[PDB]
Automatic annotation (TrEMBL), chain A:
Pfam families registered for this protein in UniProt: FAA_hydro_N_2, FAA_hydrolase
Protein name: Fumarylacetoacetate hydrolase family protein
Gene3D superfamilies in the cross-refs: Fumarylacetoacetase-like, C-terminal domain
Record keyword Hydrolase present: yes
Naturally occurring in which organism (per UniProt): Rhizobium meliloti (strain 1021)
Boundaries of every Fumarylacetoacetase-like C-terminal domain copy: 84-335
Molecular function via GO: hydrolase activity; metal ion binding
Domain of life, per lineage: Bacteria
Residues annotated to bind Ca(2+): 86, 142, 144, 173
Amino acid sequence: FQGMKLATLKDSTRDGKLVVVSKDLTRCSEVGHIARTLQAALDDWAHAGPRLERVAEGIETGAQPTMRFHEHDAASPLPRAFQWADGSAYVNHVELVRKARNAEMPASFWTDPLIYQGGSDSFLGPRDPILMADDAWGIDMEGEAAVIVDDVPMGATLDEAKAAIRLVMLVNDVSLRGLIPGELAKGFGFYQSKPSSAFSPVAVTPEELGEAWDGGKLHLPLHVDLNGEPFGRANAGIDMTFDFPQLIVHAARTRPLSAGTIIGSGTVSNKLEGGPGRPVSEGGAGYSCIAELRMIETIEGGAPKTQFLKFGDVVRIEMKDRTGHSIFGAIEQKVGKYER
Amino acid sequence: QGMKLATLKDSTRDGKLVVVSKDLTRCSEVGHIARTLQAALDDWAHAGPRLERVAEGIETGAQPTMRFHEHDAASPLPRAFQWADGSAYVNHVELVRKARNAEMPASFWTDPLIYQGGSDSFLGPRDPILMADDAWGIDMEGEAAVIVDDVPMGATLDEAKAAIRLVMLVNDVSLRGLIPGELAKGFGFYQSKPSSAFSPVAVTPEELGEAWDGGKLHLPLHVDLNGEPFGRANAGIDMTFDFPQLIVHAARTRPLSAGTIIGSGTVSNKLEGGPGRPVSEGGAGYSCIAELRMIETIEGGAPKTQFLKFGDVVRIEMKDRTGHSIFGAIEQKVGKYER
Ligand SMILES: [Ca+2]
Ligand SMILES: [Ca+2]
């Protein structure tokens, strides 16, 4: 027996309720005698992990009592986290955005990973609406993968970083494109322009991924849908200039990463014949965000065309295994106005 | 009447919450109320008043106590769900721009800077600042911070001020050597901003008395370098953005959950316009070496004062009108990290 899936169910507490989820995402089991929350399990993984694995095995064989798992009831696996740090591993994407400003990208960007520190304390659940005051802010989804690490020492090596990867999940790094230029122009990175993100209903162990996980990257299309229509099928194993251990090593240069740290891959992006990717409806692999499409329209046609997310739109993100079954469950979110 | 809270280091990640006497000599575990500061903040509307009764008992002698050792204290939140650090003393920003020779857009006087910081691995007040290389421009940064209860997205100044729960000092450890290179990448600070440290004790606004005016702390911030007065800059002067303003800015497009830490940015004072002078010369000095080097470069050509090297010792504390330490002392020796 190999692999397991974990989820956090919304409840009256801030950290929610940890459950072990069946491979098919239909059944789950509370595990309060081992750990009440995912963070607690991570805090003591060396001991809690093996015990959760036995529960996972028991769910598979039916020896373990279960209830129904409802993605609509899931929080993000860590509803609040101690760290959210997001890379830009598909350096093609940042090349496109840099090139749209009609500027050249330093060679250094192929060798030196980007990362930003994100808000970690108020993540949206996979099915919660993206609520915002104003959709003139260039609301955009950003489909990525993330790993959750155990403790990582300051100055960690690649072997250390690899070995510290405990869970994988999908992410929607919600962005406000209209606010980005002026904010970064302040010089202090992202804050207002990067609101609360959302993660998939389930996080899985590397073992669960099977051959789709090479120890440092995922080798599967990331399905991003917009209003029911395929928007991106970009392969997470293609054009990824920096893998997860590389991002982790980068992150740990001058600081430890405590257990529960979430590292984002950055928006998944694919080139086509060495050129900008083309849309799915044209045979291309599409895009994991609307920003990348607009950049390409800007380069191609001198300016953006396709509009960002407006109230009422729906975005879906999920990853399917070789046989077509969902691995992490689905992020599916309706954009709507925040009621104050 | 006010109170002081601390977290003692123990075998767990979140440490042991204690209530601390006003004189910082005694303290008491409060496990029947909350094991951790976070847990108290999570349920503050109920836990807060219970903790206040304990503080009151410590004061009268009714509550059994033990000795408080600042050396055994973690940061009050050893790990936090959020750390966001402003630069509310825009004077400092203007000086960094000046040493480069760019005018500052007048918008920096009405638009707060803020950045997302590492929150998961804070050093304790007396823990050493360990770095692999002291040629990275290791610098201290004295500031004040506030811990907030839940703040809704798009919160107002009134809600902002009402959400302030605790006040503490901070050393925002900075690697100046890496800052230029990192920021040029365009994604803000990460590698150049290592783990920070907070004061041994966090205190309620009420404890601060008049020195707190609801948005601002009005006392000198003591920064020492190897036992010498380096900064005595007043935290209520030249503070162009108050804490509520910092909070409202942070909350524009996101809620802030209970336990969110908001830093004011390095405390800096103008003399009468233009740069402050080094304490030894009658002025209020500085709360970071960087500010000093900017002043040296601007008037003179190039930095003359080195940053922190191994063996250097920094102290950061704040004393009330009567000269008693309010928060306890951050005191750290810079040292070589090795694996
Ligand atoms: Ca991103
Ligand atoms: Ca700072």
